[PDB]
Structures are given as structure tokens and as C-alpha cells.
Design a protein that fits this description.
In chain A, about 0% of the residues lie in helices and about 45% in strands. By secondary structure, chain A is an all-beta fold. In chain A, about 25% of the residues are buried. By secondary structure, chain B is α+β, with helices and mostly antiparallel strands. Chain B contains 13 helices and 20 strands. In chain B, the strands form 5 sheets. In chain B, strands 6, 7, 8, 9, 10, 11, 12, 17 and 19 form a 9-stranded antiparallel β-sheet that branches. In chain B, strands 3-2-1-4-5 form a 5-stranded parallel β-sheet, with helices on both faces. Classes of the chains: A mainly beta, B alpha+beta. The interface of B and C includes residues 263, 291, 295, 300 and 307 of B. The PDB classes it as ligase.
């Protein structure tokens, strides 16, 4: 609890909102509203060659093994997101250097999923 | 000749006139009660001056407003609308103290303010007037008029104000989607006649009821500017407020009828801080976030701004949103847009309600009369999208429970 | 057929397009770097998605933008201007992945992007082009063009961009104050020709230089929307962005040339956050207070808003202010006004500089060419009115010294 914050700024969809918490009671831009909760029970890209999703999801298939030679526009990965599967393609041409992902993994857009050397 | 004006008004129209004066290279002078200390017109104006601790009385006090006008160095004075605009005494006083009142002479104000003395002038000049058994479910059509001192009188065209609530106007459109070019010509000329009859000068509006049998019947003659002039300024190109000042500075009208031209349609929404779900209860308080609408076809005339605190003593109107397009279909679409385009946090607004109107087919079809609102109560039972200010709280509580 | 669009851009034009989509009942999708997390387009859009920690690279990255478009459910994609708008690869990719690019085909983009390959197409279609010893002190005239898939091509009229600084455009006016109806007709038709020659489709602009003899020479052909389309939307009533989308959804142009007309003049100012006193050095930082201009003749297309913090990685343009009136004299007055009407605290802007231009008689007289700015350095030596943020401090110090 000494780590957990009482007040903080939440940026949601372009807007930021000043929050102060104390069922919680919660102050959104100085407007306090009772809330109730019910509980239910990887490298970032340095390179422009570092392949990323721009939207989080789960990996369906890796279409490439380490050391492959790949040209821009090649289907490198597939992801499930928004009730669909769709193929991520290579930003850059060259060699697949690493692969930081396997089938089944959940991804977020700050994560670098493979690397490719130009 | 006129170098300084006393905007004898508050809110949104004070801002309009500030804009008009600045355009003409004329110094503007605002007046604020204590409540309107932070009002946008005050910030915007060249000079400002307190008019009392009372919210209202200083604005309706002809004599000390003119003391201020005289003390200030004002050559002329603008009464905007409501308040003292239709009160002859102010003109009389102004005249007396050497101040050009931006309006008609007090005689005509007085004449046309009396219902029975007005009805006589119109009946005399050969103009159909209402019956004691009045008109049933009429379209409310009204014609802008501009007269100068020198006997020139013209009309920019009509405006349809048939969309209204308990005798409060909501949406105004120019020209009417509901009228033939023939009707437009007739009603405009008939308005110019009446105005001439009563030896009018400056900006005025002649209102008519339009019976389901095509009979136009005179009803009022507003001897001032009106909220809904924006819509007519849009379709014609003519700055009306600027003319008012020119007329009062003794200039001749800048345009003959043949030179008055319109294109498109213009629609103006009164963005009141009320909550239609709660029988249009006022929703006074603070506007926390405001982003103004923009891009093509869009004009805003705002009282409000970011952080503005709406005082509770006056009307609910935070801004007039005025939309324009080359035609009926386009306008309505652009309406719908601009309403969403106008982003306002902290206070319940009539926007959602207006979107219901624009959705409804009788309206899109462009056939409607004063009963439309009354005749369609469903318009207030709409989907109230859940506030983004509440979603942010719900998320922040998920983060709190996820950490301690 | 098109129900969702990926606005592949940031800043002000992303907002424009958000407005265009909303108008058409089409879902919009924004893209932001981390810097642009708070940008107005993001707030305004129906959906948004991060495109990297880097300020720039994610915006110039054809392939993952399209991955996002595809992943997102976008039927089509809009590149605004700058960035990827003139890069053929993006069209090719889009085409390949089943995404309607809102622009011409990549063949034309490519052709007309190559100076030599472009000059050929024009010389072939019988169109005067520049010399290696080019044109001396020209007026920069350019013509808006709209083509559809089905071979219809058309022009809304010209606009004059002769007011510019070191090859950066400052003030754009439509139509030109400097051209006869005849010249307007000639240059418009000549533009429609060229476009037709190179089998263009969608919105484009054909630029010309105009010498002291009154000869026109082709110079570029921008195969995209442009910053200054607002000014042409103003005088014509035509929504260009809306048409771009319609063309790309395979529709026919909505208007034949005979149906396209203009009224008035429109002028548009690039309200950049720079300080002209200091060789136009950027003035990035936070905008503490912002009140948007308003009332008649006024259109704003803003990046900025109240509190916005201008990132330093991109251009300085916080908004485009676009003024309109029924004629040259009126416009200029309205210009002057609207510039003051635009109230912006926290950052130095080009407003004051523009007021100098509008003041200067050569400009009011409506005869000027690309050298006007260069040929008049005095325009930066102006009265810098003392900041209201400093007066408040001086007063507060009087209260401090008076109380203890």
C-alpha cells in the first residue's frame, strides 16, 4: 500500500483526467463518485527493422525461422485481434536476426516481435 | 464619425458586437454586472465597466448606462437584443444626451411595441393581421429588414422558426425550406411595405404566421437585431451588425434589393445549457473542457469558453452554432456533424436533443409547423451515451484494485 | 461501401478529415506517435492507435500503417498531405491489400513527382512550361482540380499564393485579386486539360507561375489535397475532402463545371507558433489560454486547443484561420479583425506579423508577387503590445508592496 497511489493523472483517448481515490470513493476532476469493484479470479524496438504490432493481440503463426532472407512486404506473422486474424508484413528488406515470439503469445505494441537487419 | 460604442448587453451578443466594432476600427466598451466579471465580451472588449452588484438591474437601467456612455466618450450605443433594446426611453435619453442609438427612433419602438397600436398601423398600410380566434398550427416565417435614415428599405430574405418549444425558438433556418420563390418574393415585399409604413429605420424583423391555407398574417415587429440574424448573414454575405452601425452613422444602405442575393441554406442551433431529459431544467455550473467546431460550413457565436462558469441569473445560451451548406440534404448532414463537432464537458446541453430532431424524417422531409416539438415528445427519450468522465473513473478503479 | 477510414496523418489535417468522415457517417481511425498522444485529432476520432515511441518514423512507415489499416477493419485510407501523401508505394501497397487509397493511382503520383517526367507529359499535352532561366518575380497562381474514376475532371477556381517567405507560403487567397475573369477561365481550363492528359483521378492542384507580361507557365502538379484548400472550399461551397472520399468510393463527381460557382474572396492565414521578431524561430511550448475566433466570415481549422502543449518534433502550425467576405476591401478588414479575434496565450505567434501585411498599402492595393515579403523587411519591425501576463505581475507587485 505504500507503493500504491492516492492521486494521479489518467490519459484515456486524448483526454487526461485528474484522479484522487480514497467500495472506493473517487474524485474525477474534483467530482467524487462512489465506485464498487468485484474481482474476478520483451525488448522494445531499437531498430526500424524491429517488427511490431500497432495493436495488442495473440500470435497465431510465425511464418519465418531465424536467419531467413526477407523482402519488405512479406507475410512474417499472423495475429488475432478484433475477432479476426491478419498478417503483419515486413517493414524492411534483409535478414531475420532474432525472433522474440512464438505461437500462442500475447503481444503489445511496444514489444519488438522479431528483428530484421536491412 | 462614430469612434466608440457602448455595448449595452452581455453574453453572446456583446461578443458579436465587439467583433463588429473591431471590424470597423471602432473602440468597444463592455458593461458587466459582478456575475459577468469573467464573461467573454469583457475579456474581448477594448474597455469595460461595472454596472452593479445586482445581476440584472444595472443592465435594465437606462439612465446610468447613458451616464456611463457619456462619461466614457461614447459617440453611440448598441442595445443588442432583449433588455433595453425594445424600450423607447433609452433612445429618447440617448438622443437627448447626444448619443446615436443604433436602432429605430423611439416613436416607432413605442408604436410597434404596443400590440393594438401596432395592429392599427399594419391594418392601415393594408396588411393582413391575426384574428381573435388566431391561426392553428402555423409555420412561423419572418423577414429580415434593413432601412436607412434616407428612406431606403430592403429585405434580406425570410427565416423559418417553426421549430420551437413552448413559444421558445430552438432551430432557425434561412431561407425556408417550406416556401416557394413566389412566397419568398411576396413576404419580403410585404415586409418592406410595413417597414416603410411605419417610417422605420435601421435593422428590424417583421414576423408572420403562415396558415395552412397560405394566408400570411402579421404578428409582431421586432424593432431590433435578433438572435437568429446569423443565419441570414450566412446565406446573403451581408454583415447586418456592421450595417446597423453604418445606418446610425447616417450612411445610406450599402445594397439595393436587386443586389441582395442568397446561396444555400443556413441553420442555427441554440446551444443552451439545459437538460432536455429533465424537462429542460437549467444545467448551470462550470464548463471544464470545450473544443470549438470547425472546418467548412461552420460558424460559432459563443458566450462560453474553456473553464467558463455559467452564472445562474440569466439565460442558458452558451453559444449559437450556425451551419451552412449548398442545400437542404447537405445542411442537415453538416448539422449533425457540427453538433458532434462541438465538444463540451461539465454541463448538460441540448445537442443530443437536436440530433434527435435532425434524425427525424418529418424534419428531414422539410415539412413542419410550430406543433412539431409538442407533437413529438419521443424526441427527448434518446440514448444518453455514458460520459467519458465516468469511464475514466471506472478504469482508474480497476488500476487501484490491481495495485493495493 | 466505405465505412471506415484510417487517417494516416496528424495535426490539423487529421482533424479536418475526422470532420469529413463524421459528416459522411463513416468511422474514423486516428494514428498517433507518443508525442501526439494528446493531439486534438485523437480526442476527436472514433478510434486511435499508437504507432511508435519515435515522433516521426511510424507516420512515414507505409507498411505497418497499412497493417493497422487492415487489422483495424478499414476499407480505405487517407494520407492527408506531407508525409506519405506523395509517396507511390503506399498506394501500391493499399491496392495490393484491398484498401482504397484516397488519392490518384500510384502511376500518376510517380509520373508527376518526377520533374522531368512531368515536364514531358505537359509539353506533350501542349502546355507552357518553365525555362532553365526561369520566371522573374512571379505571381504564384494555382488551380484546384477534381477528377473522378469515370473520366470527369473539373476545376474549382484558382488561388493566389504570391505571399510567401523563402519559398514557404504564408497567406493564400481565392480567387486571385490579381486576375481577370478571362484569366480565371483560361487557367482553369488549362489545368483541367493537363489533369486529363495524365489521366488523373481524385483531388489535385496544378501550380503555375505568372510573369509580368501575363504569361502562365506550369511548375508542379501536387497529387494530393493541400493546406490551402479551405480557401477554395469557402468561395465555392464545395466540400473537397468529402468529394475525395466519394471519388475513392467510385462515385461520379457531384458537380459538372457549369454547376460550380464562387462568391466573394477568401483568405487564409497559417497561424504558426514562431516568433517573427527572432527570424521566425520556433516558439514551441504550452498554450495557456485560447479563445477561438467567431461570428460572420470566420472559419478555423485548428490543431491547438486550451492547454495544448505543442510538441517540438513537427511543424509550427497550430491552426489555419480562414476569413471570408463579399469583396476585397471587406475581406482585408475582416482579416485584421479575425487575427485579433484569435486569442492565444503562452507562445509567440505570426498574428502580429500578418497584421503588418494587411496594413501595408501594396497589399491592400492587391498587386504583389513572390518578392513582396523579401522586398519589405520592415514588416517584422512592429509594435509588440505589452503582454497582459506581465501587467498582472506589475499590479500584483503593487499589492505586495502595499500589503506589508
Amino acid at each position: 500500500s505504500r507503493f500504491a497511489p492516492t492521486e494521479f493523472n489518467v490519459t484515456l483517448h486524448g483526454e487526461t483526467f485528474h484522479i484522487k481515490l480514497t467500495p472506493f470513493y473517487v474524485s474525477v476532476d474534483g467530482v467524487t463518485e462512489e465506485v464498487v469493484v468485484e474481482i474476478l479470479n520483451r525488448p522494445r524496438p531499437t531498430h526500424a527493422g524491429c517488427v511490431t504490432t500497432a495493436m495488442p493481440g495473440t500470435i497465431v503463426d510465425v511464418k519465418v525461422n531465424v536467419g531467413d532472407k526477407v523482402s519488405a512486404g512479406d507475410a512474417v506473422l499472423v495475429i488475432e485481434a478484433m475477432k479476426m486474424e491478419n498478417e503483419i508484413q515486413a517493414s524492411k528488406s534483409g535478414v531475420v536476426v532474432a525472433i522474440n515470439v512464438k505461437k500462442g503469445d500475447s503481444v503489445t505494441p511496444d514489444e519488438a516481435l522479431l528483428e530484421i537487419q536491412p | 464619425m462614430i469612434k466608440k460604442i457602448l455595448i449595452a448587453n452581455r453574453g453572446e451578443i456583446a461578443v458579436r458586437i465587439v467583433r463588429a466594432c473591431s471590424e470597423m476600427g471602432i473602440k468597444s466598451v463592455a458593461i458587466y454586472s459582478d456575475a459577468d466579471r469573467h464573461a467573454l465580451h469583457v475579456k474581448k472588449a477594448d474597455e469595460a465597466y461595472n454596472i452593479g452588484s445586482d445581476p440584472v438591474l444595472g443592465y435594465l437601467n437606462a439612465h446610468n448606462i447613458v451616464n456611463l456612455a457619456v462619461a466614457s466618450g461614447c459617440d453611440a450605443l448598441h442595445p443588442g437584443y432583449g433588455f433595453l433594446s425594445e424600450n423607447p426611453e433609452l433612445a429618447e435619453i440617448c438622443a437627448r444626451r447626444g448619443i446615436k442609438f443604433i436602432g429605430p427612433d423611439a416613436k416607432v419602438i413605442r408604436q410597434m411595441g404596443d400590440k393594438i397600436q401596432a395592429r392599427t398601423a399594419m391594418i392601415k398600410a393594408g396588411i393582413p393581421c391575426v384574428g381573435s380566434s388566431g391561426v392553428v398550427n402555423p409555420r412561423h416565417i419572418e423577414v429580415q429588414v434593413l432601412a436607412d435614415s434616407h428612406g431606403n428599405v430592403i429585405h434580406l430574405f425570410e427565416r423559418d422558426c417553426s421549430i420551437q418549444r413552448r413559444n421558445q425558438k430552438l432551430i432557425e433556418i434561412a431561407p425556408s425550406p417550406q416556401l416557394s420563390k413566389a412566397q419568398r418574393e411576396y413576404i419580403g415585399n410585404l415586409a418592406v411595405k410595413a417597414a416603410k409604413a411605419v417610417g422605420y429605420k435601421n435593422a428590424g424583423t417583421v414576423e408572420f404566421l403562415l396558415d395552412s391555407d397560405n394566408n400570411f398574417y402579421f404578428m409582431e415587429m421586432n424593432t431590433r437585431l435578433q438572435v437568429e440574424h446569423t443565419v441570414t448573414e450566412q446565406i446573403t454575405g451581408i454583415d447586418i451588425v456592421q450595417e446597423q452601425i453604418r445606418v446610425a452613422d447616417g450612411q445610406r444602405l450599402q445594397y439595393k434589393q436587386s443586389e441582395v442575393q442568397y446561396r444555400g441554406f443556413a441553420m442555427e442551433f441554440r446551444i443552451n445549457a439545459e437538460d432536455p431529459k429533465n424537462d429542460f431544467l437549467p444545467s448551470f455550473g462550470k464548463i471544464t473542457r470545450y473544443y470549438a467546431p470547425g472546418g467548412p460550413g461552420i460558424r460559432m457565436d459563443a458566450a462560453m469558453y474553456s473553464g467558463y462558469v455559467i452564472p445562474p441569473y440569466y439565460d442558458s445560451m452558451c453559444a449559437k452554432l450556425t451551419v451552412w451548406a449548398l442545400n437542404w440534404e447537405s445542411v442537415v448532414e453538416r448539422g449533425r456533424r457540427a453538433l458532434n463537432d462541438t465538444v463540451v464537458y461539465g454541463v448538460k446541453t441540448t445537442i443530443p436533443y437536436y440530433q434527435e430532431i435532425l434524425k427525424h424524417p418529418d424534419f428531414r422531409n422539410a415539412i413542419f409547423n410550430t406543433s412539431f416539438v409538442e407533437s413529438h415528445p419521443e424526441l427527448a427519450n434518446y440514448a444518453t451515451q455514458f460520459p467519458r468522465e465516468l469511464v475514466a473513473a471506472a478504469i482508474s478503479a480497476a488500476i487501484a484494485a490491481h495495485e493495493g
